[PDB]
Design a protein around this ligand. Structure first.
Ligand code: ATP
Ligand code: MG
Lengths: 284, 342, 115, 52, 52, 115, 86
């Protein structure tokens, strides 16, 4: 009813466009805040990687399950995902890349299972029916490491006891503001390339109580730090993907309003033209 | 092409044994369509109960304009005797178009949308002839030949809207006059909801006083629940979490929507309708997967007709409802859903 | 206006209008974006508005033939007290369907227990 | 347990065997109902068509 | 022993239920044939009578 | 009508009509939000509906002076078999372009080999 | 349309404002006086320019009021000012 409702419909789209125009700026600010948090986490992990390098590849060379090579009979992943919608295809892209590798090990007859961060991943993989052993959800902004100790400890327990022989983290990477990429990278066993030194392990550390407890706890903390950092970097990628999705929603809404207006002006003009034909015809 | 005529000729076909006489008035249709309709009424037992009044598209505008009034005069013969008649006026809007032709050719001043102003008086004097008369009026008309019987004429006019636009002059007049409307619409019909009855904008102004008590008891809950399901389904459409009242509502309403679909020329008796509605109101559908709901209904009608026909006779004859009726229907649903297969 | 109705009634009616007005704007966001995009205060207004919308319903004992249910009469005094109670917290915990065609607020709790 | 496992094994066998027969027998009741109905109404149709 | 017995029950029930459906399909095939042949015999009586 | 066409034709036509109707219902969502916001079943309706819209296309013998590519005559047995196969999802591994302007469903799979 | 063309200015009263509780219901930014500050006393002329610009800033920020928790404080100040003038 162009005289009546097309008029309101335009108002509803105009209001919707004004809102999404604002959400693009919210997302672009949260992306900045997450980007600072992302950078702070890198120096703790990079320091800890230096310590395990010094003890692992030091002149006396130690042995540990999380560090040593093992052949594969079961493979494990843990996966990060959003608790909120919008953000384009970000989750689905990562999930289909995960299914591609999960199918690759399945073709090798290698059993797989998943640990899960975020309720989108919970829902998709229950819909697939892939084995999910652990879950955490509802972090929002400001996620905390304390939550994530749960998920890693049961994956750690699985890996050490043989139930798992490889473990990977599945997450998106914040290349920059404009581009983000879904990636999978290994946690257990420790994949990192060897390194070499003289001063380190020549001016060797006094150990307390002993160098074995300090290798065990240190590895436990390192892989924990690796998945905290992946969680933060995926969160930065969520805000970036939402910022872009709100740009499209704002331009799409602006494209619809103008087509609804050309349609309305036709109805506005036609009804004037009809009713004057009636008034003049009725003045017989 | 939404099933307007199909509904009205099925309402004729079903009167074949109800004792209600039928009239079908065809205004402005093509004559081979009236051949096809009569050929379907004769393929059932319905034509021997029915009068067919025709003014095809070739016939003069005076003949089309009068055709509804001629049909009503035939229905009034039964109404004034103490017998029931059902009259269908197919395309009252074609009667208005013929009346506009007559009025402009007579140079009467055109009013809105070029119809004459009296066009409301055309339809309203037609439709107020459909009435139930008290026994005293029958006795006076029959001069004491018939005593104690109340006669009735029931009218089912049909209007075509151009684009769902109810604001046109002829639709707004006829919507003002009648005791309710059934809206059939294209979006439901294309979705496969046939009959495509929109529960929200359709209403009966007589309501429950027209029903048998069993249908009255079961059906009152259905229509307003189903309307709110459509609001709920809109509000829900992107929300990931449903509270279980909402999640239950978002399922029950889909299963009721699926239950009300029905094939053409396949009318169901009161007991058959009541049994299937009882299965939905008392929750027995809830676990059955939705595409099976169609087969569930077919198997339930088949099961009950072989094994429990004395109750079907009881309900069809009485329309009654009691605790033993609720108990026997509960026992039938409990027994069917255990023993049989969809 | 307050010079007839008194301020008690006037404040209650203007309150109900402001809530239903706000909710009509919020309802436009929800239908496309979903309800999670609201502030938790706008979510709360969407809740208490959607209740008030149902609490204004009332079955009439001239409509039992349509409804099948017993009609209700309310005093003005009881009407005011009921709307204040939805505008504040007292019934934040009842469902929406617990209001629909109820009668007084004092029996909306009972339909919630039945629901 | 060495006895509840025996008791449940016969308990399932008994129930399952009876229901499988009941299902297939009432499939024969449905078949003969369908055939009886068709075999009857074929003449109910023809006796209408010759009266026509 | 208990686990195997419960699985054997579910096989037996499901197999009987499926066999009931093909039993019903064949009765529908008979019904649709019998009624179509009734119409196709009846028309060849009516045309014969009216041609007479 | 099932009596004259028989059931397989009638069911195929009503299936095509139901999928294409549901695609119209989704297009106003897709137009603003884009497709990623759809459910994974809603994405499958779209992915089928778009194939169906292409397979409805056909090369006409009188149109060769415009299209150049040679005209096709398609049997009723091949048409109901093709659409029934698409709606059953047998062909959900082919791209949309495979269906555009092909006479029969076999011709779509040969077009798909060369994309 | 005729009277809009004839007159010197417009006070638009709106129902949404009247429902929301802005009972004088005057809608700024669509209301106008083509005479303006010549009509107005020196004190009112001096002070009223603040109101005019504050409500302009308020209208654009009102779209962010749903999620105004994560904003620049300058903006948070402006928003909490537009509301209190309103
Ligand atoms: N309940 C039903 N189920 C399936 N198909 C139906 C049903 N009712 C009607 N149809 C089909 O809908 C089509 C149109 O029905 P009908 O001719 O009654 O519509 P109409 O509105 O009268 O059309 P017109 O406007 O041309 O008079 C027919 O093909 C008919 O077979
Ligand atoms: Mg018709």
């Amino acid at each position: 009813a162009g005289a009546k409702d097309i008029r309101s419909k335009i108002a509803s789209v105009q209001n919707t466009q004004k809102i999404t125009k604002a959400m693009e700026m919210v997302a672009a600010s949260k992306m900045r805040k997450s980007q600072d948090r992302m950078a702070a986490s890198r120096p703790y992990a990079e320091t800890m990687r230096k310590v395990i390098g010094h003890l692992a590849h030091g002149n006396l060379e130690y042995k540990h399950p999380y560090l040593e090579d093992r052949d594969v009979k079961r493979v494990g992943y843990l996966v990060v995902s959003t608790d909120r919608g919008l953000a384009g295809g970000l989750n689905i892209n990562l999930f289909k890349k995960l299914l591609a590798e999960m199918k690759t090990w399945t073709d090798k007859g290698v059993q797989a299972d998943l640990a899960m961060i975020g309720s989108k991943g919970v829902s998709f993989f229950n819909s697939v029916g892939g084995n999910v052993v652990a879950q955490v959800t509802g972090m929002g902004d400001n996620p905390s490491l304390s939550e994530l100790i749960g998920p890693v400890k049961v994956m750690l327990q699985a890996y050490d006891e043989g139930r798992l022989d490889k473990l990977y983290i599945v997450s998106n990477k914040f290349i920059n503001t404009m581009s983000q990429v879904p990636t999978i990278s290994q946690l257990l066993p420790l994949p990192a390339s060897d390194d070499d030194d003289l001063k380190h392990k020549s001016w060797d550390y006094l150990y307390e109580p002993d160098p074995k407890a300090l290798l065990d706890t240190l590895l436990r903390r390192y892989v924990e730090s690796q998945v905290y950092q992946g969680v933060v970097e995926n969160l930065a990628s969520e805000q970036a993907a939402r910022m872009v999705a709100m740009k499209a929603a704002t331009d799409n809404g602006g494209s619809l309003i103008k087509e609804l207006q050309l349609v309305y002006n036709k109805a506005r003009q036609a009804s004037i033209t009809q009713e004057l034909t009636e008034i003049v015809s009725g003045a017989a | 092409q939404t099933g307007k005529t199909a509904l009205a000729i099925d309402a004729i076909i079903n009167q074949r044994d109800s004792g209600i006489k039928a009239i079908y008035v065809a205004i402005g249709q093509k004559a081979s369509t009236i051949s096809n309709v009569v050929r379907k009424l004769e393929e059932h037992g319905a034509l021997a109960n029915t009068i067919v009044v025709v003014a095809t598209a070739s016939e003069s505008a005076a003949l089309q304009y009068l055709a509804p009034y001629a049909g009503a005069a035939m229905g009034e013969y039964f109404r004034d005797r103490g017998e029931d008649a059902l009259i269908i006026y197919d395309d009252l809007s074609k009667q208005a178009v013929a009346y506009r032709q007559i009025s402009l050719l007579l140079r009467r001043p055109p009013g809105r949308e070029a119809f004459p102003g009296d066009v409301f008086y055309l339809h309203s004097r037609l439709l107020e002839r459909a009435a139930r008369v008290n026994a005293e009026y029958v006795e006076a008309f029959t001069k004491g030949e018939v005593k104690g019987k109340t006669g009735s004429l029931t009218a089912l006019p049909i209007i075509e809207t151009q684009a769902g636009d109810v604001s046109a002059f002829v639709p707004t007049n006829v919507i003002s006059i009648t005791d309710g409307q059934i809206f059939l619409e294209t979006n439901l019909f294309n979705a496969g909801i046939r009959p495509a009855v929109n529960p929200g904008i359709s209403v009966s102004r007589v309501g429950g006083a027209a029903q048998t008590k069993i249908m009255k008891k079961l059906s009152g809950g259905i229509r307003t629940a189903l309307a709110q399901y459509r609001e709920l389904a809109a509000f829900s459409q992107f929300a990931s979490d449903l509270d279980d009242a909402t999640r239950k509502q978002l399922d029950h309403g889909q299963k009721v929507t699926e239950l009300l679909k029905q094939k053409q020329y396949a009318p169901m008796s009161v007991a058959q309708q009541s049994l299937v509605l009882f299965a939905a109101e008392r929750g027995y559908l809830a676990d059955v997967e939705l595409s099976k709901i169609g087969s569930f209904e077919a198997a339930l009608l088949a099961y009950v007709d072989r094994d429990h026909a004395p109750l079907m006779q009881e309900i069809n004859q009485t329309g009654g409802y009691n605790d033993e009726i609720e108990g026997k229907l509960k026992g039938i649903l409990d027994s069917f859903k255990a023993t049989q297969s969809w | 206006d307050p010079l007839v109705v008194g301020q008690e009634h006037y404040d209650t009616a203007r309150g109900v209008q402001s809530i239903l007005q706000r909710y009509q704007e919020l309802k436009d966001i929800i239908a496309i974006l979903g309800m999670d995009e609201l502030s938790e205060e706008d979510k709360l207004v969407v809740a208490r508005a959607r209740k008030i919308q149902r609490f204004l319903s009332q079955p009439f004992f001239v409509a039992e033939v349509f409804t099948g249910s017993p009609g209700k009469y309310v005093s003005l005094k009881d009407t005011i007290r009921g709307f204040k109670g939805i505008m504040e917290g007292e019934y934040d915990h009842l469902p929406e369907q617990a209001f629909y065609m109820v009668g007084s607020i004092e029996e909306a709790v009972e339909k919630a227990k039945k629901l | 347990d060495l006895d509840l496992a025996k008791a449940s094994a016969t308990d399932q066998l008994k129930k399952a065997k009876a229901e499988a027969q009941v299902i297939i027998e009432q499939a024969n009741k449905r078949r003969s109902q369908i055939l009886d109905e068709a075999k009857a109404e074929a003449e109910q149709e023809r006796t209408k068509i010759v009266a026509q």
